[PDB]
Design a protein around this ligand. Sequence first.
Ligand SMILES: CC(C)(COP(=O)(O)OP(=O)(O)OC[C@H]1O[C@@H](n2cnc3c(N)ncnc32)[C@H](O)[C@@H]1OP(=O)(O)O)[C@@H](O)C(=O)NCCC(=O)NCCSCC(=O)c1ccc(O)cc1
Ligand SMILES: CC(C)(COP(=O)(O)OP(=O)(O)OC[C@H]1O[C@@H](n2cnc3c(N)ncnc32)[C@H](O)[C@@H]1OP(=O)(O)O)[C@@H](O)C(=O)NCCC(=O)NCCSCC(=O)c1ccc(O)cc1
Ligand SMILES: CC(C)(COP(=O)(O)OP(=O)(O)OC[C@H]1O[C@@H](n2cnc3c(N)ncnc32)[C@H](O)[C@@H]1OP(=O)(O)O)[C@@H](O)C(=O)NCCC(=O)NCCSCC(=O)c1ccc(O)cc1
Ligand SMILES: CC(C)(COP(=O)(O)OP(=O)(O)OC[C@H]1O[C@@H](n2cnc3c(N)ncnc32)[C@H](O)[C@@H]1OP(=O)(O)O)[C@@H](O)C(=O)NCCC(=O)NCCSCC(=O)c1ccc(O)cc1
Lengths: 140, 140, 140, 140
Amino acid sequence: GGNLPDVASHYPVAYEQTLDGTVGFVIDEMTPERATASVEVTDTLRQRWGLVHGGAYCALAEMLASEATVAVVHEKGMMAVGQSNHTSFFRPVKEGHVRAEAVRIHAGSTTWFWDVSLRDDAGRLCAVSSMSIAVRPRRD
Amino acid sequence: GGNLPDVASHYPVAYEQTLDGTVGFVIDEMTPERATASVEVTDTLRQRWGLVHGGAYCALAEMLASEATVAVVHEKGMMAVGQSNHTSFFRPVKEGHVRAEAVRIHAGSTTWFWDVSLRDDAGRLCAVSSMSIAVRPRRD
Amino acid sequence: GGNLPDVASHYPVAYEQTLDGTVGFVIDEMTPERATASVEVTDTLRQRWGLVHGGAYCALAEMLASEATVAVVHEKGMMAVGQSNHTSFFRPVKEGHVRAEAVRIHAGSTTWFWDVSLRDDAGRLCAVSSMSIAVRPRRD
Amino acid sequence: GGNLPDVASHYPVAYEQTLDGTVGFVIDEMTPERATASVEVTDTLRQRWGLVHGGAYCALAEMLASEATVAVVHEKGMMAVGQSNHTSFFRPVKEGHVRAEAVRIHAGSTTWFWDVSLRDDAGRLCAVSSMSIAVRPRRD
Ligand SMILES: CC(C)(COP(=O)(O)OP(=O)(O)OC[C@H]1O[C@@H](n2cnc3c(N)ncnc32)[C@H](O)[C@@H]1OP(=O)(O)O)[C@@H](O)C(=O)NCCC(=O)NCCSCC(=O)c1ccc(O)cc1
Ligand SMILES: CC(C)(COP(=O)(O)OP(=O)(O)OC[C@H]1O[C@@H](n2cnc3c(N)ncnc32)[C@H](O)[C@@H]1OP(=O)(O)O)[C@@H](O)C(=O)NCCC(=O)NCCSCC(=O)c1ccc(O)cc1
Ligand SMILES: CC(C)(COP(=O)(O)OP(=O)(O)OC[C@H]1O[C@@H](n2cnc3c(N)ncnc32)[C@H](O)[C@@H]1OP(=O)(O)O)[C@@H](O)C(=O)NCCC(=O)NCCSCC(=O)c1ccc(O)cc1
Ligand SMILES: CC(C)(COP(=O)(O)OP(=O)(O)OC[C@H]1O[C@@H](n2cnc3c(N)ncnc32)[C@H](O)[C@@H]1OP(=O)(O)O)[C@@H](O)C(=O)NCCC(=O)NCCSCC(=O)c1ccc(O)cc1
């Protein structure tokens, strides 16, 4: 349901059961240099004070940047996992959607790096995340 | 609830409906300088490859560091929100628990900083998060 | 001098004696939303293995982001200081120049955020720095 | 003059000519899990406003964490370079010394991670740096 890249015939955990399926992350565009995703804000994404949870912006950035890397590297026999996620918070989001745009800025042999912007429905920049993704040969 | 600090009579979102209650975060210890929390790994905490989601370590650190700041500052008329969350991933977790310990290292008039360590059931350091928490006068 | 913003009649340390003047940082462009600076690589910018010091990219980003904030806020009675500097290193520099471009992405009442790109003489992205700048009322 | 680990018979750049020798960084203790260094504050370490430059704390952290890794890995045929440096600034330093303690918290096959604390002469925690060091086989 998430439109994550189809790079394998089966996956260990079905979309609807994962963190991402639970909060409702959906990938829209996906290219080697750029990917977008969004999510409808519901309480499941919020913390008790009624704001989108800082963790939700982190998770959306993490999935989008990792999977954008997976889309390219899996068929090359590689695995891609987050090694560093630095998200900074500029404006709270209370409702509507959060919309993430990941732009690739470095693609090394061992590390890819993506800048992710997280905007609210008015287009305001509410958070950014710098994602460093480790790329390593798959163990099996 | 998740045992979050009881600082107000009403909260906008019930624990069990927040991202925190959905994934199952529970605070164990809380003092002004040090707090701990933990979560059972379930699929809701995982991504589709079967590992604990990077976002889940970030969210655990974010709630713990923030709420451990709230516990001190709420009664002083202040709000505390995540301003920066830098989480780095050293070893994946596939199953069991993730346990977090937040140690406060700076308590400034406008910013508190917490180092958070995230450990598996074997005690191994799987991730760390450097949490910066903004502390502002509460709005009407 | 290094062409830093001229906002005060006296400064505690002369350009040529600061770390900035010692290594040779010079600001080229400065507007409220965007600033650029550059430095010639000399041994003073290098570490003992002959590469540009990681600290040198961090210092270039720090001075540029801070002073580009000073340029706006000093006349408003505010001081601006680095609060967080996250620099990530993609490709080393052995000789030539390092050129920095800071693009402002958030200008909040208490925090400004700048994305800084650090490029070699070939235009290649060698490092980036996410600069968070605290903005406070100036003390007597 | 810096007491950096002696792991090779010659180096590309002599200590006194490097950034580190110019500002005066000196390593005191050095073990596989922990290293310390300090530097006397002089104008060469300060910015124009008379404070220690944020870049100086970054550079001290960077050299100490990289070289602490070099001390162990060079004789194993590896190179160690900074891949990420995230320094956060809690209190300015105006004079005296800055004293850095690097503690190793993860030693992977490709990445080592060090927490560095930077204290003033009164022992106050003025800055911290999270250093991720890439370890790679040497090319020659
Ligand atoms: C960190 C890393 C090695 C990781 O690689 P990656 O993201 O997968 O990128 P990739 O491996 O594709 O390589 C990119 C470039 O890195 C360099 N590189 C990568 N691997 C190696 C290697 N094994 N040996 C030598 N150079 C390498 C190389 O220049 C490469 O370009 P190319 O020749 O392959 O086209 C690479 O991004 C890099 O070298 N970044 C720059 C590191 C840097 O310059 N840090 C600052 C200086 S070192 C730290 C320091 O300040 C210090 C100060 C004082 C002191 O006493 C000691 C150290
Ligand atoms: C960033 C911040 C202002 C945030 O404040 P916080 O976390 O709420 O801490 P708090 O406000 O409790 O204050 C801690 C100490 O900071 C200083 N401080 C805080 N607010 C102020 C203020 N409004 N005015 C003057 N000093 C202040 C002061 O020393 C304070 O101690 P105390 O005198 O109150 O006991 C404070 O942590 C701080 O001052 N940190 C250090 C910033 C720093 O030194 N950065 C590096 C140098 S500035 C950046 C730079 O490298 C640069 C280079 C070249 C160039 O041309 C320009 C800039
Ligand atoms: C961090 C900070 C307060 C810093 O302020 P700044 O960079 O100077 O920005 P500025 O003060 O100009 O304000 C920007 C917007 O922030 C909000 N804000 C700023 N100051 C305040 C304040 N004193 N009171 C209420 N809202 C404020 C407000 O929306 C403001 O817009 P406006 O209404 O003034 O137009 C502001 O950037 C901000 O609010 N960012 C978002 C913080 C955020 O949403 N973090 C994640 C959620 S809180 C952390 C968390 O996940 C958590 C999870 C579970 C749990 O149990 C507890 C916490
Ligand atoms: C990042 C890195 C691979 C780099 O390695 P390092 O710092 O040199 O550490 P090292 O290579 O020594 O290995 C440490 C452990 O990492 C794992 N690992 C390392 N290399 C590999 C590999 N090639 N294949 C599988 N596992 C590996 C392995 O568990 C290893 O332990 P051991 O079996 O070797 O004893 C390793 O630190 C690591 O795996 N860290 C954890 C990564 C992580 O769990 N990130 C979060 C989950 S993935 C990102 C994400 O959230 C996501 C969400 C949704 C979605 O749709 C996609 C992704």
